Amino acid sequence: QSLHVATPLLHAPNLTKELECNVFLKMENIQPSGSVKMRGIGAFCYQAVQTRGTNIQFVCGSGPNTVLAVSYCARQLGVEAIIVVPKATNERICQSIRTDGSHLILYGENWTAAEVHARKLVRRNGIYVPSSDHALIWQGHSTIVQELKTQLNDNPPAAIICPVGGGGLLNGVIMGLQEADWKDVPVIAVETHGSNAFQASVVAGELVIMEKNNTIATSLISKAVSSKSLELSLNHPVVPFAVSDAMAADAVRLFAEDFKMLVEASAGAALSLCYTHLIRDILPSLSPAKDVVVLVTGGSDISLAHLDEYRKKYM
Numbered sequence: 001q002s003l004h005v006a007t008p009l010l011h012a013p014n015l016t017k018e019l020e021c022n023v024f025l026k027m028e029n030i031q032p033s034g035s036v037k038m039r040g041i042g043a044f045c046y047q048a049v050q051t052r053g054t055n056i057q058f059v060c061g062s063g064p065n066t067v068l069a070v071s072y073c074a075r076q077l078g079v080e081a082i083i084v085v086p087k088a089t090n091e092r093i094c095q096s097i098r099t100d101g102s103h104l105i106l107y108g109e110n111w112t113a114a115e116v117h118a119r120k121l122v123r124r125n126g127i128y129v130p131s132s133d134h135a136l137i138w139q140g141h142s143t144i145v146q147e148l149k150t151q152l153n154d155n156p157p158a159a160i161i162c163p164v165g166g167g168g169l170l171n172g173v174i175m176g177l178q179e180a181d182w183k184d185v186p187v188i189a190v191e192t193h194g195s196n197a198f199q200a201s202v203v204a205g206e207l208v209i210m211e212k213n214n215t216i217a218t219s220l221i222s223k224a225v226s227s228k229s230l231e232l233s234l235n236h237p238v239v240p241f242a243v244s245d246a247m248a249a250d251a252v253r254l255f256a257e258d259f260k261m262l263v264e265a266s267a268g269a270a271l272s273l274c275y276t277h278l279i280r281d282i283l284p285s286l287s288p289a290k291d292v293v294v295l296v297t298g299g300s301d302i303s304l305a306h307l308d309e310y311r312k313k314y315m
């Protein structure tokens with residue numbers, strides 16, 4: 001069936017009180033490998049093996065949580081994995097990949113360069129695993145909504161807050177909502193100002209290309225958003241919103257204090273709409289009779305030293 005697991009939907013009572021609205025947190029940090037990537041990437045990897053067999057090699061350099069998901073899936077599926085990460089990568093990320101039995105290569109100043117290098121390593125029976133832009137990834141991610149429907153007792157929420165990098169998760173959410181007949185549920189698509197290709201693309205009505213962007217929200221860096229994201233944004237209620245690195249960092253700190261979990265600034269971006277109350281400015285109708293769902297995407301590009309740095313720099 002699938003490599004991902006059903007995850008908890010936690011009530012956030014201090015937030016619910018503060019916001020005068022029910023806040024639920026969808027906990028993707030519980031997935032094998034530590035992030036929501038397990039859904040999308042799990043689906044891609046599973047299908048690749050069903051079609052191509054177990055003599056393939058998975059190849060990936062497309063971001064920290066993608067490579068972790070690929071490493072995990074390759075071990076579960078009994079397949080070779082070739083993984084590239086930037087020269088200065090978090091050591092536990094490296095150890096996890098080695099422990100899985102993947103072949104780890106250290107290369108590049110950032111994840112874009114790791115990806116560029118990884119792409120050149122794909123041989124005749126190798127398959128490159130993208131982070132976001134593939135139909136299988138969207139299908140995999142869409143499983144989150146089927147779960148949400150059950151967990152919320154078929155009551156459509158007032159909004160779903162969804163971090164956006166390349167738009168894979170976004171696409172699965174919107175597609176899941178259409179399949180669930182929740183076509184009217186707004187998705188708040190959150191990015192940081194440092195890399196806002198989705199938001200910029202919606203303004204332009206075409207795919208904006210960005211180079212050299214950086215942000216603490218590593219998994220949200222993308223040169224462009226998927227063409228599918230822009231297409232779906234025309235036919236479903238989507239609100240693009242951007243927050244600062246300082247807001248995302250503060251949310252990571254607050255979530256660690258409140259829920260005792262360390263999540264990436266990527267997930268912190270979505271949580272920041274609640275912690276800052278900006279959600280109320282976006283949806284002025286919110287009331288204690290209404291529900292908001294935050295997709296807490298998890299991620300492994302976070303550590304105690306990140307939290308030291310965030311506190312010093314942004315607070």
Ligand SMILES: *Cc1c(COP(=O)(O)O)cnc(C)c1O
Nearest residue numbers: 065165166167168169266297299
């Ligand atoms: C992949 C990911 C996202 C959203 O990514 P897309 O590229 O838009 O699919 C958000 N948070 C984390 C931690 C991720 O790994």
